[PDB]
Design a protein around this ligand. Structure first.
Ligand SMILES: [Mg+2]
Ligand SMILES: [Mg+2]
Ligand SMILES: [Mg+2]
Ligand SMILES: [Mg+2]
Ligand SMILES: [Mg+2]
Ligand SMILES: [Mg+2]
Ligand SMILES: [Mg+2]
Ligand SMILES: [Mg+2]
Ligand SMILES: [Mg+2]
Ligand SMILES: [Mg+2]
Ligand SMILES: [Mg+2]
Lengths: 109, 119, 95, 52, 324, 116
RNA sequence: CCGAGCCUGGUGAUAGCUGGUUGUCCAAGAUAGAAUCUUAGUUCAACUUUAAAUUUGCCCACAGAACCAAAUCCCCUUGUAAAUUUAACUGUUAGUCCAAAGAGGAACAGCUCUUUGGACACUAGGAAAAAACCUUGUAGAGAGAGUAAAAAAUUUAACA
RNA sequence: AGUACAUGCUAAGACUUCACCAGUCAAAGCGAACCUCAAUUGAUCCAAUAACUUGACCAACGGAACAAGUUACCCUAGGG
């Protein structure tokens, strides 16, 4: 009497892992719950998929977690913590390699 | 033209700026910083500084906040930083002394809104 | 399809392909997306943006369409004001 | 419980868009965006499409 | 497979069996504060910083603070938040005591030390001031960090500083056209007697700055050296080029910097004049040209791609006909 | 990750409790949950004394469960407040009790009765 | 020869089913799966064959991969020679057993269902006979030589 | 199911239920203020509609436009 449950895998996870040279708009990681948090030049979509926003190299660090105070769940979970405890969570950054553009000669008046 | 750290979306504060004013109101002294994205302090305004401390009655009130607002707005006028992205938490934004700080920023000549990057 | 017809002995095009697709002379097939006019009350505007597009076909899919039409539909057509006229050639290929 | 209705332009004629509305509440008058006048235009509900 | 960690485990010393006896996060602010001090602290894992990185004066201050707080009017204006502070006296006393600290901060932000002196920092003790005379009515103050149009900077400055010989450099550390390392001088007045500028020995004559069109902003540093012993030194752009690093190194035995003030220049019509009239130059025009946008290798069969894919890879947007 | 040296840098449920007799085993003698009925003729005095005893409880590391009250009675109306207190030592019991004894403003009686 | 006569014609009707498909040599050449009035079947796919363009393919090391055990992913050096793309098609996919991590069944079955690694459908020696166990692979002649794996060991109870 | 009517127009680059069809995220730009949940669903042709749109428990849910029981009279090509 166990009907259903024949759903296939979601095929989520990390798409462009640390060390991979990544251009603009590429999806870094798709996740179901907040496994990762965005860092520098990294954006998040509505379905909690996590993309690179500038061209560069994907790097994974681990940083402090000091969320927005309107998100009352995480902030109230902060006010359940003792004095020495601060949440650390994993962050994704893209180190930008290619520069902004170059000053070059155009017209010689 | 230069990039901003446009991400850091889930976490507070947002890093999509070039210069950040951060005010910590301690028990005794209120300070306001103007920073780059590197974490490096560009412009400092502290009541731990005798030239502004000797002209104030108490180093923490609305009066000291208005005084250091005038001081840092002046300082950014001689420092050439003309544009801002400032993020207060919603309970502090409703406070009277730091909305007087925002008014001081507006009258000083430093706009509390950086222009958008040109792509 | 019919490989040898009973009157002429010629190949026959399936007319579904002709009435549903578009052949570019470079070898590409243009189609609409399935269901761009069905149940868009429940559809987010990103989805109806994506569904309202002229979409190409896969390699095997394009060859399966090429085998199902004949040499008349494979030809250079020099119309007056065809909107798709600029897309008939493939440029700057390095394969 | 809900009805899918058609929401018909007062300005930007020939332009309509559909919404969901309760079976019991009142008749929709809305401010949508018409691209023909490319402005915010009041829309009025005329005909229901399908009660789901 | 669990491996032991390298350094100390965070949030481990507080891990007790009775967390209720430990004092608690009541607020939202203490947490972000503590997280800020630890985020500024280095760690042994990979972090963001790795990749993106006497008594008499005190007694007098205490007496002045006691005398100022004893006034009934000051307290009454403070409790009614109507009290104000005169900015001129605060600006002056900032210029005396703790101004140079903010000056090293502003100069190190602008990359002045890392290229001007190759990282050799100093303390500009002198409360320097410069002004460009605009009209007969006003004068534009060159402190450190501002912007001056070259119309305002067309004429030789007036330099005011309260001190007691001196040398005066104007450096354009980024205005060079050929070398990406050198810099162009504009004026350099050695053997200054006291605080008067007109009696000094000019080495190179004053030239207005030239920020070319589209070359962004150019930073201009007023560098002011103490001088112990008078030292003899020495419109062609090949003669206006040198480096400040080895130039300071050749004389640094009796040569100490004590004043900095840097400001910005943009393109305007006076820059057209400074190329045209007395330099006799056609103006080089620059534009910020972006790199071309990314597109992948053009596939044979663009599966699921839109029709626009035949315009990503097209350079000319006109109907070509080939052999016909 | 499970195999990196930084395993579990972000775990927090070991720092959170995601969830009564006296505890007197052999050496650590402990009160249970208390009930202090501050009964007074005035709402103001009883409320202020409840506030002050709560502020001495939270400043001396005392667990306070509830600060509720029962309804008044018609007689003059008799108000009261209940302050539940857990966490004491015998020396601390003497000191906290004598502070409460010496802090009574005007005619307010005390109680240290147990639960139920 | 009647649960619906027989003969001729349509009719070489139809059948996813059964069986059969004929000279030689060489070379390349074996097990994911998703759908499907679908599990005796077919399409896509995976693998495979040929030809062509181009440059990286495999093994991989520091670093790195979340809160509620084996391991795996990414991965420069190094060893190596293959890989991607284009053009064009055929053919195979209830596999069986063993070791290991699991489930159902009796913690029976030469029983059924996932994952990893072998082997059999490809040569030979050995374990008695031996698809799956150990040794061993690229091809021939020799009335030469060195080896691999390769033989079951056990026989007992007095008591103050 | 709920709120809202920019749940607007376009447009680099990617993910993807082991194929396809399907789905998803989206930099920048124009135009403006200043979405949550996990599944919450259905293709083609055909119909209604001037148009925009809409139509199945087609739930046997990749759906043929609509078709039940029984044969110890059963028959045929196969398999155990
Ligand atoms: Mg499952
Ligand atoms: Mg499955
Ligand atoms: Mg036949
Ligand atoms: Mg062979
Ligand atoms: Mg069959
Ligand atoms: Mg590699
Ligand atoms: Mg051999
Ligand atoms: Mg797929
Ligand atoms: Mg956008
Ligand atoms: Mg079915
Ligand atoms: Mg089906």
């Amino acid at each position: 009497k166990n009907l259903g449950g024949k759903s296939s895998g979601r095929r989520q996870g990390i798409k462009k892992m640390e060390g991979h040279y990544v251009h603009a708009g590429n999806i870094i990681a798709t996740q179901r719950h907040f496994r990762w948090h965005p860092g520098a030049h990294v954006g998040v979509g509505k379905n909690k998929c996590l993309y690179a926003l500038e061209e560069g190299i994907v790097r994974y660090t681990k940083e402090v977690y000091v969320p927005h105070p309107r998100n009352t769940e995480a902030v109230d979970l902060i006010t359940r913590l003792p004095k020495g405890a601060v949440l650390y969570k994993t962050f994704v950054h893209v180190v930008p390699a290619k520069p902004e553009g170059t000053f070059k000669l155009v017209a010689m008046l | 033209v230069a990039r901003k750290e446009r991400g850091w979306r889930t976490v507070f504060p947002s890093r999509e700026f070039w210069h950040r004013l951060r005010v910590i109101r301690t028990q005794h002294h209120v300070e306001a910083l103007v920073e780059h994205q590197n974490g490096k302090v560009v412009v400092s305004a502290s009541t731990r500084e005798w030239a502004i401390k000797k002209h104030l009655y108490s180093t923490r009130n609305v009066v000291a906040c208005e005084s250091i607002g005038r001081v840092l707005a002046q300082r950014c006028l001689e420092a050439g930083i003309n544009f801002m992205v400032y993020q207060p938490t919603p309970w502090e934004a409703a406070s009277d002394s730091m909305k007087r700080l925002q008014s001081a920023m507006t009258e000083g000549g430093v706009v509390l809104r950086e222009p958008q990057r040109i792509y | 399809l019919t490989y040898f017809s009973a009157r002429k002995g010629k190949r026959k095009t399936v007319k579904a392909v002709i009435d549903r697709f578009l052949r570019l002379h470079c070898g590409l097939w243009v189609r609409r997306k399935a269901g761009y006019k069905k149940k868009l009350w429940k559809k987010t505007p990103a989805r109806k943006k994506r569904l309202r597009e002229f979409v190409f076909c896969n390699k095997t899919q394009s060859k399966l369409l090429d085998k199902m039409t004949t040499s008349f539909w494979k030809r250079r057509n020099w119309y007056v004001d065809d909107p798709y006229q600029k897309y008939h050639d493939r440029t700057n290929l390095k394969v | 419980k809900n009805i899918l209705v058609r929401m018909v332009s007062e300005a930007g004629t020939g332009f309509c868009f559909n919404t969901k509305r309760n079976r019991l509440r009142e008749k929709l008058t809305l401010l949508h965006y018409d691209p023909v006048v490319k402005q915010r235009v009041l829309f009025v509900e005329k005909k229901k499409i399908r009660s789901l | 497979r669990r491996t032991p960690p390298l350094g100390p485990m965070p949030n481990s010393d507080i891990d007790l069996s009775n967390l209720e006896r430990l004092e608690k996060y009541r607020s939202f602010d203490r947490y972000r504060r503590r997280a800020e001090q630890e985020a500024q602290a280095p760690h042994w894992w990979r972090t963001y910083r790795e990749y993106f990185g006497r008594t008499q004066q005190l007694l007098e201050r205490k007496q002045a603070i006691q005398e100022l707080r004893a006034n009934v009017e000051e307290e009454r204006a403070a409790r009614l938040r109507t009290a104000s502070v005169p900015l001129d006296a605060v600006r002056a006393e900032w210029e005396r005591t703790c101004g140079p600290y903010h000056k090293q901060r502003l100069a190190e932000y602008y990359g002045l030390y890392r290229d001007l002196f190759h990282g050799a920092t100093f303390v500009p003790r002198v409360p320097l001031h410069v002004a460009y005379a605009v009209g007969e009515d006003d004068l534009m103050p060159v402190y450190c960090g501002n912007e001056v149009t070259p119309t305002e900077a067309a004429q030789a400055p007036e330099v005011t500083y309260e001190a007691e010989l001196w040398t005066l450099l104007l450096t354009s550390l980024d205005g060079h056209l050929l070398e990406p390392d050198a810099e162009y001088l504009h004026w350099l007045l050695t053997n200054i007697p006291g605080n008067r500028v007109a009696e000094g020995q000019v080495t190179c004559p004053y030239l207005p700055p030239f920020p070319a069109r589209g070359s962004g902003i150019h930073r201009l540093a007023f560098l002011l050296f103490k001088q112990d012993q008078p030292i003899d030194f020495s419109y062609q752009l090949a003669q206006r080029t040198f480096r400040t690093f080895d130039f300071y190194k050749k004389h640094q035995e009796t040569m100490t910097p004590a004043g900095l003030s840097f400001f910005q220049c943009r393109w305007d019509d006076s820059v057209t004049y400074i190329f045209h009239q007395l330099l006799d130059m056609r103006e080089p025009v620059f534009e910020f040209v972006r790199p071309p946008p990314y597109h992948p290798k053009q596939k044979r069969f663009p599966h699921r791609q839109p029709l626009r894919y035949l315009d990503r890879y097209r350079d000319s947007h006109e109907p070509t006909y080939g052999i016909y | 990750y499970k195999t990196k040296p930084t395993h579990g840098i972000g775990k927090y449920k070991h720092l959170i409790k995601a969830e009564v007799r006296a505890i007197n085993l052999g050496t650590d003698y402990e009160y249970g949950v208390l009930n202090i009925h501050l009964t007074a003729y005035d709402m103001t005095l009883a409320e202020s004394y409840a506030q002050y005893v709560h502020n001495l409880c939270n400043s001396l590391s005392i667990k306070v469960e509830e600060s509720y009250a029962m309804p008044t009675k018609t007689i003059l109306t008799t108000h009261e407040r209940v302050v539940q207190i857990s966490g004491l030592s015998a020396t601390f019991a003497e000191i906290f009790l004598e502070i409460i004894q010496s802090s009574l403003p005007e005619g307010v009686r005390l109680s240290v009765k147990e639960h139920t």
